[PDB]
Amino acid sequence: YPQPKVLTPCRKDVLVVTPWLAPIVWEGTFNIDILNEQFRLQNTTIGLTVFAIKKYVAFLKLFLETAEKHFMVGHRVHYYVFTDQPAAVPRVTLGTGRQLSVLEVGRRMEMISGCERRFLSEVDYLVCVDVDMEFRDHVGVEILTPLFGTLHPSFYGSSREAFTYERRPQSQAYIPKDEGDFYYMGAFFGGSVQEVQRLTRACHQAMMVDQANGIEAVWHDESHLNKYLLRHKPTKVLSPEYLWDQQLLGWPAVLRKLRFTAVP
């Protein structure tokens, strides 16, 4: 492979590492051949969780189809579809080493954290996403790490005072005006099973405290996710390549790939 050269940065237009030395994942920063070998040597299994409740079942066909094309191809994958309509889950043909479980429900942080023992035995990493999305390009093992969040596409160019963190100190999700690294979106986070269970258990515990005190954070679990990732910093951060809306935001030059996007 091309020899990296220490005096020629690959990307000079974007921050590629956080101040706590976590990689920020952009096209041009990783050699996927290297990463694939590292992960295949450990026989890595990746769990992907998606909620499809009521009308949202309609998004599953395109979500699954495009995950088969782009999501961890070559690696073991276990999709977990949480739904109130098990009969509505479309039968999508899967590649080898890939499987799908339907988990009938009848919220997300709770549901992710009481499926606890099942995830620990079955997968090495968990990735938690929204269902009303599609994969358009590679999303692979470059994202994998103990704990990751994703830069919210509307706020990656913003100053922190503008971040819509929870601002009331009455809420467990409270973050002062002068604190904050990034604004992560709730739609794409993950990590090792142990770290995701820690995060979702914390967020759930914090939501219950707010509920008992008669307050809902301004953006619900995303507020708590942001407070958690402030205090427990992620070991990788995904760039907005990993969570985009072309309809609302276009295709800026800074995004060399649009990998996982909102459905119009």
Ligand X SMILES: O=c1ccn([C@@H]2O[C@H](COP(=O)(O)OP(=O)(O)O)[C@@H](O)[C@H]2O)c(=O)[nH]1
Ligand Y SMILES: OC[C@H]1O[C@@H](O)[C@H](O)[C@@H](O)[C@H]1O
Interface contacts to a second copy, rule CB under 8 A:
1, 3-25, 29-31, 34-35, 38, 142, 151, 156-157, 159-160, 180-182, 233, 236, 239, 254
253 marked as binding residue:
no
164 marked as binding residue:
yes
174 marked as binding residue:
no
In the complex, minimum distance from the CB of residue 47 to ligand X, in angstroms, rounded to a whole number: 16
Residue of 63, 188, 219, 228 interacting with ligand Y (CB under 6 A): 219
Let me know if 199 is exposed, middle or buried by CB neighbors in 10 A (0-12, 13-18, 19+): buried
CB 236 within 8 A of CB 145: yes
- Measured CA to CA, the distance from residue 99 to residue 91 in angstroms comes to 11
In the complex, minimum distance from the CB of residue 12 to ligand Y, in angstroms, rounded to a whole number: 29
Query: Which residues on neighbouring strands pair with residue 143, listed in sequence order?
Result: none
Smallest Cα–Cα separation from 223: which of 208, 236, 243, 206? 206
- 162's contact among ligand X, ligand Y, a second copy, none, with CB below 5 to 8 A by partner kind, is none
- 54's contact among ligand Y, ligand X, a second copy, none, with CB below 5 to 8 A by partner kind, is ligand X
Query: Which residues on neighbouring strands pair with residue 244, listed in sequence order?
Result: 261
In the complex, minimum distance from the CB of residue 69 to ligand Y, in angstroms, rounded to a whole number: 25
246 lies in the binding site for ligand Y (CB under 6 A): no
In the complex, minimum distance from the CB of residue 149 to ligand Y, in angstroms, rounded to a whole number: 12
182 marked as binding residue:
no
User: Catalytic residue numbers?
Assistant: 222
Q: How many CB atoms lie within 10 A of CB 227?
A: 23
For 70, the token pair is: 């782009």
User: Which string of DSSP letters, residue by residue, matches 23-55?
Assistant: BEE-TTS--HHHHHHHHHHTT-EEEEEEEE-GG
Sign of the CA dihedral running 253, 257, 260, 261: positive
Determine the residue type at 257. K
Interface contacts to ligand X, rule CB under 6 A:
51-54, 56, 130-132
- 185's contact among a second copy, ligand X, ligand Y, none, with CB below 5 to 8 A by partner kind, is ligand Y
Binding interface with ligand Y (CB under 6 A): 152, 154, 164, 185, 219, 222
Binding region for UDP-N-acetyl-alpha-D-galactosamine: 51-53, 56, 130-132
Binding region: 51-53, 56, 130-132, 152, 164, 222, 245
